[model samples]
Target: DFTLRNARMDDIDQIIKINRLTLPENYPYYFFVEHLKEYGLAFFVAIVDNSVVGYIMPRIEWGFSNIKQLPSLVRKGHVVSIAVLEEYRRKGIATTLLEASMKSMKNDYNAEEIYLEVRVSNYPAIALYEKLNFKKVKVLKGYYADGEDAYLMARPLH
Candidate 1:
């Protein structure tokens, strides 16, 4: 069984390890700490037996991205990174983590929307975000370190 909770500062080490093992992007320790400190309520972890099995790190911001016809800033939460350990994939842990953080973003931060970028080749993840009502709104050219294009996905919060 997996238990979900807001990630504490002590959990940062394990979160870093999990991210390194699962995601292609490599962030430094302070990067993780910055999000955890600034958006602790939006950072969540799925744990089993005291070990982090998955995590979602989100940040709230006033920005002008992801909108098809926006000319000004919007308050929204951005999913900086999300990943589940390899053995834990397909267990719905990622969905649970995302849902938990989204709830926090809306209720805690009062965000108007949420967005994230996914590589064009990530079919399953794109499918999952679509299932969760996130729409593909724009294409970011050379968005990744490897120069892969990314689809910017967004969903409104009510």
Candidate 2:
């Protein structure tokens, strides 16, 4: 069985490890700590056997709405990174982490909408986001370090 909980400073090591293992995009140690300090409520980790197996880290930003046409600034939630261990896939961990973080982003951070960029080749992740009602709003060319394009997807919190 697995448990989902808000991430703590002590969990940064495991979170970084998962990020390295699962994705090409990686951040430095201080970056994770800074994010935890700034938006801990919207960050979540999945644990099994008292070990972190997955995590979702999101931050609040003042930016244009991803799903709205209004020409005004809005509170936005950006999913900086999310990852699950290869051995832990298909157990609902990623979805749980996302659902919990999104709720926190909306209720605690007052984020009007949430957005994330996914590699265009990541069909499973794109499908999962689509299942959560996220729509692709833009294409970011050469967005990844390896020259892979990314799809900018977003969903209104309300």
Candidate 3:
């Protein structure tokens, strides 16, 4: 079985490594710490032997906010990040981690839709999302630091 659990403060270092490996978005230490707090956000990880091989950060929210970004959400669960170690690919870890995150979003957040974005060049991740029934809804231009395109994908909550 997977050691799927809420992210612990002690695992931020591993999380950073995972992020650095999977994406160019390098988050500072405090930003990473802020994501693991008790409110507003939910971050989870899968650990083995004191090493975090993978993690998923989910945003849980309800109601609305006037801010444009605040309005970007619509009572749906959002997957902020999901990464697995390069050497550990194809072991079904990302799938399991995603499943756990969706379960939490469904049971705990009352989410009606779930969405995420993947770098258009990331074929494996795109395939994984398609495997999970996510469809490309749109593309975000220059969404990456390297000016790479991103595909906005979504899946029905049900």
Candidate 4:
């Protein structure tokens, strides 16, 4: 069975290993330890038999991004990333983590909205978010360092 829980500092090694095998983005050890300490940053891990099998990393902000004349607004949160080990894919691990993450954001941070960017080619993930009631409100050009276009998705906390 798989369960979602808070990601402890000691779990960095396993998270890094899972990120290497699953997500395309790579994070350094220092980021793992230091970033989450900053305001509104939180991480969750999915464990199976004492091993980390998936993870979701997110950050809360006072505002949302303003594509027009205004700067990124202070409103809710931004989901940085989500990854699940290859063998653990399609086991509802990501689903569990995402739901737990959103609840934590709303209750712990008292957030009113959630936001994230997904690559244009990431159809599967977009589908997943759509299933969960996310709507794309903006298109970012060259948003990823990898030069992928991104669709910014947002949903009300209620």
Candidate 5:
């Protein structure tokens, strides 16, 4: 069985370590704390010996639907950050973390959909997300701090 649970405030430090190790986009301490405070239900962690090895942080947003002409407020979830330690790769840790986040997003916020952005060069991440039924919806130019482009991927929930 996997160790999946909602992220507790104390776990932010270890979660930051996982994020820094796996991703080029390093978030400040306040970012993690704010997300946990605002969307704790949608933030999940995979722990080993009380240390966070992986995490997925999702945020709820009320806005127009992704469809440009949508004329109503919609509740959607955005995956703010997700990562698993390099050593823990390919062991289903990331998948577990994603599943938990999506579940929470759907149930906690009644989100109509969830979306995320991934660097265009991150093929493995794209593949994993595609395998989970997320589709590439748009390309964001110079989306990263390093001027790298990104794919805006999304998955709809019924």
Candidate 6:
């Protein structure tokens, strides 16, 4: 069985481990700590059989609109990082985590919209975001250290 809950300080190490094992992008330990401190309500972890199996962490940002035609600054939720253990995937864990985070981003933070950057080659993730009503607004050139481009996906909260 799997369970989901807000992340705690003690869960940091396990969350970092999962992130290291799964994603090419990584952040320093302090980054996670800061997000937990500032965006605790939007940070979450998944537990399965007494182990932290997945996590989704986001931060609130004031940024230019990703989905609008006019130039405007808006309150937005940026999905910093999210991952599920390879063996634990395809069980709706990722979807649940994202949904929970999005809820907090919208309600707790009063964010107008949310956005994320995904490698262009990451078809599965892109597809999942599409299902959640995120639209591809732009392509960021050389967005990754490996020189891969990224697709900026976003959705309005309302």
Pull out the clashing pairs in model 1: none
The TM-score measured for candidate 3 stands at: 0.83
For residues 105-156, could you state the per-residue lDDT of candidate 4 as single tens digits? 8888876777888998998789888888888889999998878999998887
Worst 10 residues of 1 by lDDT: 65-74
Per-prediction TM-score: 0.94, 0.96, 0.83, 0.87, 0.92, 0.96
Q: Which number leads on lDDT?
A: 6
Tens digits of per-residue lDDT for model 3 on 14-85?
Answer: 898899988767778777676567322346787776679998878765643222333454676778788888
- For all candidates, the clash counts are 0, 0, 0, 6, 0, 0
- Tens-digit lDDT track of model 5 for 6-125: 998899889888788877789899999998989999889898776788898888998866544334678889998998888778989987888888888999888888889999999999
Expressed as tens digits, the lDDT of each residue in 64-89 for candidate 1 is 75665544677899999998888888
Q: List per-candidate RMSD values in Å.
A: 1.6, 1.1, 4.3, 3.1, 1.9, 1.3
- Candidate 3 ranges with C-alpha deviation above 4 Å: 38-42, 61-73
Q: Relative to the unseen true structure, what is the Cα RMSD of model 4? A: 3.1
Poorest lDDT segment (10 consecutive residues) of candidate 6: 63-72
lDDT at residue 127 of model 5 (Cα atoms):
94
CA lDDT scores, all candidates in order: 0.90, 0.92, 0.76, 0.78, 0.86, 0.93
Native-to-model Cα distance after best TM-score fit, residue 57 in candidate 3, in Å: 1.1
Query: Which ranges of candidate 1 are over 4 A from the true structure?
Result: 68-72
In model 5, pairs of residues that clash are none
The residue pairs that clash in candidate 3, if any, are none
Cα lDDT, model 6, residue 152: 93
> How would you order the candidates by lDDT, starting with the best?
6, 2, 1, 5, 4, 3
Task: List, residue by residue over 12-125, the lDDT tens digit for candidate 6.
Answer: 999999989999878889999999999999999999998999999999999788887524888899999999999998899989999999999999998888999999999989
Ranking by TM-score: 2, 6, 1, 5, 4, 3
